[PDB]
């Protein structure tokens, strides 16, 4: 038979990057409001994080990792993926992030107007 379980083993070994966390959401039948962008070999990372939305509330930055949302897996989900999964809906919504010290980018947009719309 198999039902399944997990386990786990603490030790005094580095902690490498800054553990996991989990950070709470709000929605309350509202958006999150941030950005998120998509990395050639990597995974989804966030670009921005609109002040006084539903993130900003949770307390989101950028660099911000997103590890999971709400349990999916941000990993393998895409910019397309990530900007509609964080884009849900759901009163109360969990994330996965973890601080990576090593990320510190910047770059300007392009040069454009009120154009395509």
């Given at each position: 038979?198999?039902?399944g379980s997990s386990g786990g083993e603490r030790?005094?070994?580095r902690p490498y990057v800054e553990e996991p966390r989990h950070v709470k959401v709000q929605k309350g039948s509202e958006p999150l409001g941030i950005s998120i962008v998509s990395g050639e070999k990597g995974?989804?990372?966030v670009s921005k994080v609109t002040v006084g939305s539903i993130a900003?509330?949770?307390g989101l930055e950028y660099?911000?990792?997103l590890?999971?949302?709400n349990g999916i897996n941000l990993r393998s989900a895409?910019?397309?993926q990530a900007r509609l999964i964080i884009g849900q809906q759901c009163d109360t919504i969990t994330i996965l992030a973890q601080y990576n010290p090593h990320v510190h980018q910047l770059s300007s947009h392009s040069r454009s107007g009120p154009s395509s719309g």
């Open positions: 038979g198999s039902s030790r005094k070994d995974g989804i990372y900003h509330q949770a660099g911000d990792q590890l999971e949302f895409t910019e397309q």
